[PDB]
Amino acid sequence: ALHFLDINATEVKKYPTAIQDIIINRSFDGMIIRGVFPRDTMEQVARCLEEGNDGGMKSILNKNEEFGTKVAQIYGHAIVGQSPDLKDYFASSAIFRQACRTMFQGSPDFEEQVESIFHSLSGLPVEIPTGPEGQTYTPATIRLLLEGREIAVHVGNDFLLMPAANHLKTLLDLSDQLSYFIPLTVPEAGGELVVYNLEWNPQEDLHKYIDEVESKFKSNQSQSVAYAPGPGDMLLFNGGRYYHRVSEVIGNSPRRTIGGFLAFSKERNKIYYWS
Ligand SMILES: O=C(O)CCC(=O)C(=O)O
Ligand SMILES: [Cl-]
Numbered sequence: 323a324l325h326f327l328d329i330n331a332t333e334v335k336k337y338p339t340a341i342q343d344i345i346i347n348r349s350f351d352g353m354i355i356r357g358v359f360p361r362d363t364m365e366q367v368a369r370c371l372e373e374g375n376d377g378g379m380k381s382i383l384n385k386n387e388e389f390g391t392k393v394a395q396i397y398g399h400a401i402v403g404q405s406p407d408l409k410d411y412f413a414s415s416a417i418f419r420q421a422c423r424t425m426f427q428g429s430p431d432f433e434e435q436v437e438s439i440f441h442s443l444s445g446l447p448v449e450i451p452t453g454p455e456g457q458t459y460t461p462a463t464i465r466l467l468l469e470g471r472e473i474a475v476h477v478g479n480d481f482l483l484m485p486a487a488n489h490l491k492t493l494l495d496l497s498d499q500l501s502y503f504i505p506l507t508v509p510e511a512g513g514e515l516v517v518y519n520l521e522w523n524p525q526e527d528l529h530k531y532i533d534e535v536e537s538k539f540k541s542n543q544s545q546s547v548a549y550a551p552g553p554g555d556m557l558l559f560n561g562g563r564y565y566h567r568v569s570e571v572i573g574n575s576p577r578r579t580i581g582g583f584l585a586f587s588k589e590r591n592k593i594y595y596w597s
């Protein structure tokens with residue numbers, strides 16, 4: 323039942339209602355957009371991180387050691403699992419934007435490239451949502467997935483019913499939250515995005531959430547598709563509706579991705595993207 327599209331970033335303007343078709347029409351569920359960022363740009367950013375000349379990106383690195391092998395280490399705080407006050411979230415968001423802008427060196431700039439992609443797929447203006455006191459949300463976060471580590475099965479729409487999304491929920495339309503990511507570094511094997519035909523149910527603590535989803539996902543039978551995008555390719559899929567995960571990274575070479583989420587504004591006149 324799951325349908326994805328394999329298109330190049332040079333033909334995004336040929337699909338002007340893509341985001342509309344996934345969220346509202348539900349005619350197709352995912353999109354793999356090849357060559358959004360060049361391979362050299364992805365190599366240079368990855369090299370900036372591992373060497374430490376990252377514009378202070380390492381200062382907002384969350385090892386997530388309190389969890390198991392079923393989560394990624396993350397550069398900046400992701401909205402998921404944050405406390406409802408968002409004080410730490412908003413401070414890391416500002417550090418992220420600056421450090422990310424520095425690493426990309428406008429070759430192309432991460433924020434404007436991605437925004438021009440979401441705008442090409444909608445025809446609507448693309449913005450990073452603002453907090454209650456005018457603070458910026460982070461446009462994305464960098465997920466570092468080491469050997470033996472994976473991103474455990476979850477569904478995206480569950481996140482907008484959590485206390486951290488209390489303010490953001492009021493800015494968005496009552497519809498499916500899309501999920502996006504672009505690999506910086508890809509592993510030798512593993513680190514695949516496995517998407518299941520299984521759907522989110524409204525009436526059905528991150529440590530508790532991981533254990534709850536896994537126990538319910540255990541019983542249910544579903545169809546699966548696997549995607550391993552290359553460095554610079556965008557994977558824009560209905561992560562809000564469909565249960566998905568990232569398989570165990572095989573080999574010494576780690577998996578590094580820059581991504582987040584996107585959903586329509588209350589009046590469907592704007593696109594909001596964050597992490
Ligand atoms: O690989 C990533 O960056 C996160 C994958 C994922 O679970 C998502 O995009 O929703
Ligand atoms: Cl998600």
Ligand SMILES: [Zn+2]
Pocket residue numbers: 476477478501561566
């Ligand atoms: Zn996800």
